[PDB]
Fold this sequence. Notes:
5 chains, A: alpha+beta, 5-stranded mixed sheet, 4-stranded antiparallel sheet, E: 5-stranded antiparallel sheet, 4 helices, 21% helix, binds magnesium ion, binds zinc ion, mitochondrion (chain D), ribonucleoprotein (chain D), ribosomal protein (chain D)
Amino acid sequence: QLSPTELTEMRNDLFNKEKARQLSLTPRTEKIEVKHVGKTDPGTVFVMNKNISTPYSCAMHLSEWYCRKSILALVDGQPWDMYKPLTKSCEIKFLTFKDCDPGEVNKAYWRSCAMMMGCVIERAFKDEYMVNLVRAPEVPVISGAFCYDVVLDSKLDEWMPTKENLRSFTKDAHALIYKDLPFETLEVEAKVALEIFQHSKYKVDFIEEKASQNPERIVKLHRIGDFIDVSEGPLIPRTSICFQYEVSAVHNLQPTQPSLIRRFQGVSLPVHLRAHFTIWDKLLERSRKMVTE
Amino acid sequence: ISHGRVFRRMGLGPESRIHLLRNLLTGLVRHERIEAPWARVDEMRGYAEKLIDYGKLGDTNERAMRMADFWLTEKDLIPKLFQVLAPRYKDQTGGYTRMLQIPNRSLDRAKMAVIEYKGNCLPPLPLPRRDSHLTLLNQLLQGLRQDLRQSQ
Amino acid sequence: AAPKNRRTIEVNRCRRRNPQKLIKVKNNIDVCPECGHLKQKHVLCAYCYEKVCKETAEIRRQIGKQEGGPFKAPTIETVVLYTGETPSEQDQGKRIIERDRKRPSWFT
Amino acid sequence: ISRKWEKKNKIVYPPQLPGEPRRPAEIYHCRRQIKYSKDKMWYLAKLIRGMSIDQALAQLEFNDKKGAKIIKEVLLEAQDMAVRDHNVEFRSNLYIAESTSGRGQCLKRIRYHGRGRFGIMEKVYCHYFVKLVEGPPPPPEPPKTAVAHAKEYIQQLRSRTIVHTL
Amino acid sequence: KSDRSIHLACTAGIFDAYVPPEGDARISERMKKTMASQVSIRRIKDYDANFKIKDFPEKAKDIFIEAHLCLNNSDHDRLHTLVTEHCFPDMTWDIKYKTVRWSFVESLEPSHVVQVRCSSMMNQGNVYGQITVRMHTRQTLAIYDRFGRLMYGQEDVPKDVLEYVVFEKQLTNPYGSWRMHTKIVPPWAPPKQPILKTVMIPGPQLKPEEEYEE
Lengths: 293, 152, 108, 166, 214
Ligand SMILES: [Mg+2]
Ligand SMILES: [Zn+2]
């Protein structure tokens, strides 16, 4: 059995070696052409570097405003991470929180916040007890809370967290937000994701179903610092996008057998859409309420 | 001490104040959208609302005739008022004018304003619009509204 | 009254570089999203407003050409048509102002 | 008169070893003989010191001064020469390191007073100097903490010696 | 209407430019091109009877090599000596505040005198002769900035180059010498090595009354 520390650096080593393998697979510089087709600054051509350049690099070419407000990128109509390297000469379009249809940006935000809460739980529970992460359900924005399913210890099968425990979870999430880590992205082979997450049967099942749904068995891994997780899609650039964060509630799922799956629910709001104290309290109460998928 | 003083001290006196506001009101009725300093636009906005009320009182009213004769200095805008603007606002009750702030005059850096009568034929102003309902915060508040609806 | 002594550069620097004298940084600057240009939150966008002003200046030139002289304001409503469309059945008894360009996308 | 700011722009450096930091780009620009007072131009420069280039352009665009418009033009052309000749990668990746205003060559005109008295008017001119450095703007210095204040007091107390003795 | 006129030492044109044959790099009327090249050879022999066309290509290779070495160490008078006045500014201006590290490794095959043309008499009393030589060698290049960071190329890696370099001499000049005039790069030449930085090409800047048309 591996200690939590050593499983952490081995996962980090595997992630770094795969990233170095992709960068070595693209050893020579190569110029691609990116056609900014946005409504603002129309028809703008960038000559980016292949598999090195980012939509953040395109935004940094344009202006600082595009860096600070652009949360996602449409590359040929598909949602693209801001720090994900570009592969092919395409058309780009930056998406912010305050667009006419911010739905993809919302999905990326809620997925990012769920993965941050999962990291908080995993590094919050004690060494003598056991933590495993099942998945983050793709729950709609309209529900009011992000959910992470965690299998906890049989010693804590009866245990219920208290208000100070939930506030400690919130303080750890705010510590991550203050640390301001970038959301590193890796498109990886299903085999490679399997030896990365080989010591988690639920992660193996999730990786297998993602490899089943796509033809080439390429899944998406994301990293904030040392925590690595499998994602359903693209994410926000930095944890500092989150401004108001709270781990509201913890619940048990209905089937206690064979194992107790606990759904952690939280609610968050970015800097660009920060709410007032009272409105935030009402959102807190709705997030404390049950969310079913 | 200017407690409870609702009127601005403009021009060379009350003469010049009413004459300046009358000229601005005339330009507004003729062109349906003018730009002017912000204080003058505010005062003339109040007068424009009351003038449309008199136009809705109507041309057969001799009092409305005398008021329009005073406050319109070209005498062709009186048919325009009484047969164009009042029928345009026969359904509305008091929301006839729109004031927006335009940044600064390029010469003396005066706070500028554009005032228009609603409706119009001119190209529309770039009005400030609220955030879309598909925004994240609006979706959470809409879900809260639904939850309160099924709760009660 | 006259100065009894010459004020030194230290006292002058204190008075002239007091933070009340300095220029305050503005926080209400936002990117107008119709044209991607800088605006303030409470004012209209300068670029969009100048666009509207130039278009309505062309409209008013056409209205003046159709009017032909002072003191001839019409007693009917007015609509602007561009090239490539007919006046609709609601715009029957309205003065037609014709423009020799495509209808701009922001004009409905 | 002297044009050492332009000569500073024309200074060149030796080639870089492959194992040392990247030496961020420096761009010097100036405008001379501006019909404006050097004190008011100082207020504008002290406004845009240490900002990012886009932050400075926003502040100067929504300031209400002739000097603000002039400095905005100078900043735009400095950014253009930055990413046209000095190999700056991104046009937003600049900050204002130095921004100051100097005196220019002025003119003496008469100002007619009462009686037979007269004064001398000064048609004031000024220069504007700017230096743009490639990279993100440096973080503002964090305010001194009570821990640091207690630390410096303890350091003085431990630096005390017995004076005027052996 | 002064008597003194500008005494130009060279021109800025190529008399009947050598169109590079397609596939000359891919593969490792001839009488007419040959008799023209040798007509101009006769004229150059008349104006100086000590010219050997067989002895030219090593001198051309030299003039190339030391011209680029004087470009390396910014030796401008020697660049004037080995380089024509039309060739100088588009060789020096773009590197005026840059450091160029150029080196000559080897020659893959010997250079070939592929074209010889000569001017007419009526060029202000001066008659010029131009010779185009195909050069196919192996070279290194590492252009640095004003700040010493690298722009272009690699420091040590040598790469193949193909070139149709054209030299010109003022034959009527008593002190004339063979100097590099221009270079013909073919229209079918392979694309250049990519630059190491990123470039944004801005779109059309629009006045407010203008509309964006695609
Ligand atoms: Mg007054
Ligand atoms: Zn705008």
